[PDB]
Amino acid sequence: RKDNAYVSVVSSNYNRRFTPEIAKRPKVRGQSGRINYYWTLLEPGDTIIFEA
Amino acid sequence: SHNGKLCRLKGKAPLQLGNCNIAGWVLGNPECESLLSNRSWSYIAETPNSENGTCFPGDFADYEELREQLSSVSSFERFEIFPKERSWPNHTTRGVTAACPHAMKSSFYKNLVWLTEANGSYPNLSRSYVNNQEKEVLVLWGVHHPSNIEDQRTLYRKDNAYVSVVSSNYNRRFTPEIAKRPKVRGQSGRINYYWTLLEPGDTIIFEATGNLIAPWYAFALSRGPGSGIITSNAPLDECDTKCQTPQGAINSSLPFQNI
Ligand SMILES: *[C@@H]1O[C@H](CO)[C@@H](O[C@@H]2O[C@H](CO)[C@@H](O[C@@H]3O[C@H](CO[C@H]4O[C@H](CO[C@H]5O[C@H](CO)[C@@H](O)[C@H](O)[C@@H]5O)[C@@H](O)[C@H](O)[C@@H]4O)[C@@H](O)[C@H](O[C@H]4O[C@H](CO)[C@@H](O)[C@H](O)[C@@H]4O)[C@@H]3O)[C@H](O)[C@H]2NC(C)=O)[C@H](O)[C@H]1NC(C)=O
Ligand SMILES: *[C@@H]1O[C@H](CO)[C@@H](O[C@@H]2O[C@H](CO)[C@@H](O)[C@H](O)[C@H]2NC(C)=O)[C@H](O)[C@H]1NC(C)=O
Ligand SMILES: *[C@@H]1O[C@H](CO)[C@@H](O[C@@H]2O[C@H](CO)[C@@H](O)[C@H](O)[C@H]2NC(C)=O)[C@H](O)[C@H]1NC(C)=O
């Protein structure tokens, strides 16, 4: 329900912002959209914050 | 002991770059016209100070990776990926610049096409290409970053534009940036150059609402077991030597050297 959106992942060693992109892509496994995957390693005593 | 001359290696002549570096050969610099002919080689030779590369200023993304990929290449087959007169009917493809001379005139690269407005409007752009040549295809393009908003408005009729290049292994979106820059070769704008390799059976899609230096010619590469790049100043002549150094050729069977 929004033309523009953002994802923010903040930690004490991670701080990144992601903006979705819309385009026409070749079909892989029958789908044209994409999902990009990300990972991090939380240390003991640390806090991770997800905003979306 | 060495001859002091570059020469043959197993019956195949080397590719002498001359006054061009790798950027001027792959982009099609106007002073590097003799290097754009279907051919094959054994190795590549460089003059140490070659000053005919990117005549329009900018950043070549991943130069050294392109050099490492072009080290183990035997031959290329240059073909026309997008015909200039056919594929762009709603834009003006006649774009020249004074930062790249040719014969006391102004010209552009021989493998790229500068697209500008036509009849006061820049329509949306979307092209595709499918690889069917059973080998890898090297594709090159560029994104323009002007100096002021008046240049952008006079050449593209939009303040905001974007370029999108999507393949099955490449997916990247580009936005132009406008700022004040120091003058390099008489121009303050920039053009940033980019490259990719299409696998066999893959499709590349270009989309643009502005600021695109579209591809014109592409290379079909073949791999080989033994090749390399040598930086040297010795003149080319004839031999059939099995060993080659930058300082000359070697013909013996002793197990060591100090050349
Ligand atoms: C601090 O920095 C910021 C950012 O760097 C500065 O913000 C910029 O200020 C300038 C000047 O105020 C703005 O330019 C203005 O844009 C207006 C909106 O443009 C609309 O109309 C355009 C019409 O296009 C036609 O005209 C242009 C020339 O304007 C031609 O180049 C073009 O070929 C066409 O013929 C549309 O194209 C556009 O999409 C918009 O719909 C303009 O109205 C305005 O024009 C005035 O100035 C012209 C001379 O430049 C003159 O010829 C006109 O008659 C008119 O008087 C002007 O171009 C920037 O848009 C603005 N940037 C942003 C991001 O907003 C800020 O000014 C600066 N602070 C200080 C103190 O300098
Ligand atoms: C190819 O290289 C030559 C020299 O290596 C370039 O000639 C120089 O051009 C600049 C202008 O940018 C002059 O200031 C120099 O005086 C020129 N030097 C000589 C020796 O002529 C030439 O412009 C290059 N051509 C391209 C297309 O990049
Ligand atoms: C370089 O090789 C390409 C093929 O890789 C040649 O392009 C072919 O040219 C012939 C004759 O015009 C056409 O019938 C083919 O359809 C073309 N093939 C492709 C895929 O474009 C090109 O002409 C060669 N150039 C030379 C001789 O330097």
In angstroms, the CA B45 to CA B247 distance is 12
Query: What DSSP string describes B59-106?
Result: -BTTHHHHHHHHHTEEEEEEEESS-HHHH-SSSB-----TTSBSSSSB
Is the Cβ atom of B55 under 6 angstroms away from ligand 2? Answer: yes
Shortest distance between the Cα of B168 and any Cα of chain A, in A, equals: 7
Beta strand B229-231 with B44-46: parallel, antiparallel or unpaired?
Answer: parallel
Please judge whether B171 and A34 are an interchain contact, meaning their C-beta atoms are less than 8 angstroms apart: yes
Question: Nearest to residue B25, comparing CAs of B16, B181, A32, B134?
Answer: B16
> Other CB atoms closer than 10 Å to residue B29's CB: what's the count?
24
> Other CB atoms closer than 10 Å to residue A13's CB: what's the count?
9
In angstroms, the CA B187 to CA B100 distance is 11
Terminal C-alpha separation, chain B: 8
Is residue B77 less than 8 Å (CB to CB) from chain A? no
Token output for B17: 């770059």
B234 CA to centre of ligand 3 in angstroms:
34
Specified resolution (Å)? 3.0
In angstroms, the CA B20 to CA B202 distance is 31
Token output for A36: 């990009």
Please judge whether B164 and A34 are an interchain contact, meaning their C-beta atoms are less than 8 angstroms apart: no
Shortest distance between the Cα of A4 and any Cα of chain B, in A, equals: 16
From which experimental method does this structure derive?
Answer: cryo-EM
Ligand 3: nearest atom to the Cα of B38: 28
* A26: nearest CB among B126, B168, B173: B168
The one-character DSSP state at B232 is: -
> Other CB atoms closer than 10 Å to residue B127's CB: what's the count?
16
How far are the Cα atoms of B56, B57, B109 from residue B102, in angstroms, in the given order? 13, 17, 10
A23 CA to centre of ligand 2 in angstroms:
41
B199 CA to centre of ligand 2 in angstroms:
37
**B12: Cβ–Cβ under 8 A, 6 or more apart, which residues?**
B40, B41, B42
Residue nearest to atom 11 of ligand 3 (CA): B79
The one-character DSSP state at B27 is: H
B38 CA to centre of ligand 3 in angstroms:
9
The one-character DSSP state at B168 is: S
B-chain residues within 8 Å CB-CB of A34?
171
Strand partners, B129: B204
In angstroms, the CA B96 to CA B93 distance is 9
Pocket of ligand 3 (CB under 6 A): B 37-38, 77-79, 220
Terminal C-alpha separation, chain A: 13
Q: Which ligand is nearest to the CA of B104?
A: 2
**B171: Cβ–Cβ under 8 A, 6 or more apart, which residues?**
A25, A34, B165
